[PDB]
A and B are shown apart, each in its own frame.
Chain A
Amino acid sequence: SPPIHTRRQGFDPADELRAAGTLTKISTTWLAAGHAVVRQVLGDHKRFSTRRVFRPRELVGNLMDYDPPEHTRLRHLLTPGFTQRRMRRLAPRIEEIVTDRLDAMEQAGPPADLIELFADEVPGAVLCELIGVPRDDQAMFLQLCHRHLDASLSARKRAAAGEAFARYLVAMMARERKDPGDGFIGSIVAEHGDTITDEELRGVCVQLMLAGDDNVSGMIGLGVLALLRHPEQIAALRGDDQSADRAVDELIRYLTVPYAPTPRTAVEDVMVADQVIKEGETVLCSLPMANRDRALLPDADRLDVTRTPVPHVAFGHGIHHCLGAALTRLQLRIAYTALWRRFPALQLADPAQEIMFRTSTPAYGLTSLLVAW
Chain B
Amino acid sequence: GAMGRPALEAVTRPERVPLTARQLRAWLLARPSEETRGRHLSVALRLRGRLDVAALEAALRDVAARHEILRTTFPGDAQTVHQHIHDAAPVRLTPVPATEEDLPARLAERGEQLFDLTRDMPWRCELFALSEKEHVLSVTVHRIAADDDSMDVFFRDLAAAYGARRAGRAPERAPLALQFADYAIWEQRLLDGEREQDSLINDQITFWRNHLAGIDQETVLPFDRARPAIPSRRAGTVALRLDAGPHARLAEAVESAGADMPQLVQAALAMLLTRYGAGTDLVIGTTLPRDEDLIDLEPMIGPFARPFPVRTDLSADPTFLEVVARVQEAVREARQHLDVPFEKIPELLALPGSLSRHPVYQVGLQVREEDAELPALRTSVEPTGVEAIELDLAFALTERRNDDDDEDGIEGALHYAADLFDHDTAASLARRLVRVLEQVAEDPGRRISDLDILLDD
Contact = CB atoms under 8 A, between A and B. Distances in A.
A300 interface: no
Contact of A164 (B156, B298, B376): B298
Interface in A119-156: 134-137, 139-140, 152, 156
B295 interface: yes
Contacts of A93: none
Interface stretch (B106-114, B158-166, B336-344, B418-426): B158-166
B377 interface: yes
B375 A139 contact: no
Interface residues of B, number: 23
Given A104-B373, A107-B376, A107-B378, A136 B173 contact: yes
A172 interface: yes
A108 B164 CA distance: 20
Contacts of A70: none
Contacts of A172: 174
B409 interface: no
Chain B at the A interface: mostly helix, strand, loop or mixed? loop
A172 B49 CA distance: 36
A168 to B, nearest CB: 7
Nearest to B165: A136
Given A104-B373, A134-B172, A139 B160 contact: yes
B163 A136 contact: yes
Contacts of B75: none
Given A140-B299, A171-B177, 12 more contacts: A107-B49, A107-B377, A107-B378, A108-B378, A134-B172, A136-B163, A136-B164, A137-B172, A157-B292, A160-B292, A160-B295, A172-B174
Nearest to B49: A107
A140 B177 CA distance: 14
Nearest to B295: A164
A25 interface: no
A136 B171 contact: yes
A109 B378 contact: yes
Closest 10 CB pairs of A and B: A135-B172, A136-B171, A134-B172, A136-B172, A137-B173, A136-B173, A136-B160, A136-B164, A164-B295, A134-B173
Contacts of B164: 135-136
A100 B164 CA distance: 12
A172 B159 CA distance: 22
Interface residues of A, number: 22
Interface of B: 49, 156, 159-161, 163-164, 171-174, 177, 292-293, 295, 298-299, 373, 375-378, 405
Interface of A: 100, 103-104, 107-109, 134-137, 139-140, 152, 156-157, 160, 163-164, 167-168, 171-172
Contacts of B174: 134, 137, 168, 171-172
Contacts of B292: 156-157, 160
Most buried by A among B49, B174, B292, B405: B174
Residue among A109, A157, A160, A168 with most chain B CB within 10 A: A160
A150 to B, nearest CB: 11
A100 B375 contact: yes
B86 to A, nearest CB: 23
Contacts of A164: 295, 298
Contacts of A136: 160-161, 163-164, 171-173
A140 B156 contact: yes
B160 A140 contact: yes
Contacts of A103: 375-376
Given A136-B172, A136-B173, A167 B295 contact: yes
29 contacts: A103-B375, A103-B376, A104-B373, A104-B375, A107-B376, A107-B378, A108-B378, A136-B160, A136-B163, A136-B164, A136-B172, A136-B173, A137-B160, A137-B172, A137-B173, A139-B160, A140-B156, A140-B160, A152-B405, A160-B292, A160-B295, A160-B298, A163-B295, A164-B295, A164-B298, A167-B177, A167-B295, A171-B174, A171-B177
A139 B295 CA distance: 18
